[PDB]
């Protein structure tokens, strides 16, 4: 079985899920330069910065 009971991600492969499930931990080095939230990938980062939240670049 490989379906996150939280998000519902579908990853028939372990490495894919095994990693996903481990993300619900604290393995997110990508921390926003303002909030206290973080992500496991740099992609989501840009997604959180592109928003008009707080990025007076």
The residues that touch Zn ion, with contacts defined as CB under 5 A, are 4, 6-7, 32, 34-35
Query: What residues pair up with 10 in beta bridges, in sequence order?
Result: 3
In the block, tokens 């992609």 appear at 43
Query: First vs last Cα of the chain: how many Å apart?
Result: 44
Nearest to Zn ion of 4, 39 (CB atom): 4
Nearest approach, Cβ of residue 4 and Zn ion (Å): 3
Query: What is the nearest approach in angstroms of Zn ion to the Cβ of residue 45?
Result: 9
Note whether 34 and 25 are within 8 A (CB): no
Q: State the minimum distance, in angstroms, from the CB of residue 46 to Zn ion.
A: 12
């Amino acid at each position: 079985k490989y379906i996150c009971e939280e998000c519902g991600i579908r990853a028939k492969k372990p490495s894919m899920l095994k990693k996903h499930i481990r993300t619900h931990t604290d393995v997110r080095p990508y921390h926003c330069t303002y909030c206290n939230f973080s992500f496991k990938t740099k992609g989501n980062l840009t997604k959180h910065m592109k928003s008009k939240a707080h990025s007076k670049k």
